[PDB]
Design an enzyme around this catalytic site. Structure first.
Site, PDB file in Angstrom:
ATOM      1  CD  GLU A  11       1.045   8.859  -6.352  1.00 30.66           C
ATOM      2  OE1 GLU A  11       0.428   9.899  -6.169  1.00 30.66           O
ATOM      3  OE2 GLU A  11       1.428   8.162  -5.457  1.00 30.66           O
ATOM      4  CG  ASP A  20       1.179   7.346   2.015  1.00 29.29           C
ATOM      5  OD1 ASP A  20       0.267   7.734   1.888  1.00 29.29           O
ATOM      6  OD2 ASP A  20       1.602   7.201   3.402  1.00 29.29           O
TER       7      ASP A  20
END
Ligand SMILES: [Cl-]
EC number: 3.2.1.17
Length: 164
Positions: A11, A20
């Protein structure tokens, strides 16, 4: 290697609000803020979550705070899930982390749909499961990440994460 290091690698870590891979407002270590296109709404959720006026940004310690919370939620989630639990309980440690990784990324509801892969993982059909796992939007959208996780399920080792 452990789940925290694994997820950290997958991540990354960002202190300011970012969109994202799906264009969703997120921050920290993949902490989803909101699915809405509104930066303000994201700013609100950020404040609510941290409990202070942040104006889109946070510290490393706050990021790690969200992180600890998020990991715990995924586990608690898996454990509460009728479909996920049996699989999860059936895996060796290393493989269990891979399941957590998917849940963290896609949610318990999203992972619960990998019905066939789930059954294969349950039966310990490593190679077969890896193949089925790859036939997914998941794999087509985030290929390098998906590869690491599948390799993990296939081998029962941390190799996909060694040397990164
Ligand atoms: Cl990727």
């Amino acid at each position: 290697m452990n789940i925290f290091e694994m997820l950290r690698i997958d991540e990354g870590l960002r202190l300011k609000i970012y969109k994202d891979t799906e264009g969703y407002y997120t921050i920290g270590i993949g902490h989803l803020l909101t699915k809405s296109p509104s930066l303000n709404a994201a700013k609100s959720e950020l404040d609510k979550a941290i409990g202070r006026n942040c104006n889109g940004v946070i510290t490393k310690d706050e990021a790690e705070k969200l992180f600890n919370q998020d990991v715990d939620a995924a586990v608690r989630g898996i454990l509460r899930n009728a479909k996920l639990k049996p699989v999860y309980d059936s895996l060796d440690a290393v493989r269990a982390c891979a399941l957590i990784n998917m849940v963290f990324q896609m949610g318990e509801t999203g992972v619960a749909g990998f019905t066939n892969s789930l059954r294969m993982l349950q039966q310990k059909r490593w190679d077969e499961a890896a193949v089925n796992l790859a036939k997914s939007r998941w794999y087509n959208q985030t290929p390098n990440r998906a590869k690491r996780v599948i390799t993990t399920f296939r081998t029962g080792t941390w190799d996909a994460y060694k040397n990164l």
